[PDB]
Design a protein around this ligand. Sequence first.
Ligand SMILES: Nc1ncnc2c1ncn2[C@@H]1O[C@H](COP(=O)(O)OP(=O)(O)O)[C@@H](O)[C@H]1O
Ligand SMILES: N[C@H](CCC[C@H](N)C(=O)O)C(=O)O
Ligand SMILES: [Mg+2]
Ligand SMILES: [Mg+2]
Ligand SMILES: [Mg+2]
Length: 508
Amino acid sequence: HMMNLRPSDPVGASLRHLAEQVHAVPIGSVEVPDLHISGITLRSQDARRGDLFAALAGASAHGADHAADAVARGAVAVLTDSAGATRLDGTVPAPVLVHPNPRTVLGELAATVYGRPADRLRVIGITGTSGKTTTAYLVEAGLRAADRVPGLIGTVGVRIDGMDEPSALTTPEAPDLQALLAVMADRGVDTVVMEVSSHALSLHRVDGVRFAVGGFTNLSRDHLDFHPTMADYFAAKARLFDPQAPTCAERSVICIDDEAGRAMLAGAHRPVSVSATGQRADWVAEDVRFAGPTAQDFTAVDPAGVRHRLRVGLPGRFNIANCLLAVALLDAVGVSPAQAAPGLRTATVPGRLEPVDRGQDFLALVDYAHKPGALSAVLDSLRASATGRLAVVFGAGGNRDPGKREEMGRVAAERADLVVVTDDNPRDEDPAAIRAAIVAGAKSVAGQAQIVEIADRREAIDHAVRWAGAGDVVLIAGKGHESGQTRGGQTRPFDDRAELAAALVART
Ligand SMILES: Nc1ncnc2c1ncn2[C@@H]1O[C@H](COP(=O)(O)OP(=O)(O)O)[C@@H](O)[C@H]1O
Ligand SMILES: N[C@H](CCC[C@H](N)C(=O)O)C(=O)O
Ligand SMILES: [Mg+2]
Ligand SMILES: [Mg+2]
Ligand SMILES: [Mg+2]
């Protein structure tokens, strides 16, 4: 029954001032009161003394049906839409405001209520198809090494001043994010690094955030079950860099190693370009050197002409680009490469090319990639002379884009020496039919990959671990930091890191 995290003593705001700020109007004939509002939420179970409850239309349900409960829990006022109003007329003992489309103003209302936390610290937002999480963790580690106090908001969770924050949401709505930024400022955070997804930029979830710096990794095909076309997907991410958009960051740090990045740079507010593929850019990586199985040395060249010799403590060639972007973002908030370097060398990223070491003589790691494009990239990222043979173990989710299954098999069989097709959250589907589609795609490739099908994921991990010899690479893909195997409405624990470690201890 743990309610969502709020700042302990927010400045708050008068309801009348909030109504004037966003052109909300009273539901009825009574003028908006100067009632003190100390919080805002869209979830009645998170409502508490002093809150404005946002009662909004949603999936086959309207929050107005929960407004009486929110007020009973201590909310002192309600903000709703026209539909909600007709349903709240004279039913709750609290003032009600109506707005044409409240979802579009919740972020700015929460910014006011929580004291404009994005003006108390520097917010870095990072968007792009892949690399948001790794880049964010590298930035957080660089800030800590520089003796700054960082906050991190990402897919895995939230961390504040070096401490996990389990009471915060990983995918906050706009009011939740403002509350979390205020908590961070209260706890001494001077710089927040957060992932900003195309969903968030399309659904008003980062409205009201002043972004000091925006970063762009790359774009490839993804999220087309939400965006109608690639052009809509690009346009959503462009909202972080377009000077005409209210979400535009004050400085844009853009990787130009793909077509989308080059186009983003051309229209971006106050652009800084970054390239780890040899192209001309303000920041470039050069002189990349092998540094053992889980580290890579490189030189970051800054726009002033200074060469910084650095180490990123991650495997995978594309992590040079993520580290270079992290370095440029850190510079944009006043952290030098030398100050950040100890953090870049030691950072760990949960579920993103995350190695597990139990003393074996080969590289064994877990990665989140669960779609063909990301899987192709991570397999390519692990291709290098040091890499003997490469094995990948994965499956595909039930009740998730079935059209990707053959393609995942294809991309794996084009790149890996051993492809182990197993189960990964078959959910309400026939698990054997999912594996069959992946296997068919893998077999359609002309090459020399060995294709093995093992339904049980523990057995599949075990098979790959037993197969590996000195200098080989074993990749367990598709779950990353996410624990669980869901079948027919039941979920059993299954953490790929724990299961990989157990196989390594047993077999190695
Ligand atoms: N710069 C990159 N280019 C291509 N693929 C990447 C990059 N960074 C990470 N990946 C891969 O894509 C997936 C998502 O990586 P992550 O670092 O979580 O990105 P995001 O947070 O943008 O989803 C992982 O499975 C990883 O293998
Ligand atoms: N958590 C995300 C990714 C899961 C990826 C893969 N493990 C799967 O279950 O399809 C989801 O629910 O779509
Ligand atoms: Mg995504
Ligand atoms: Mg992510
Ligand atoms: Mg957690």
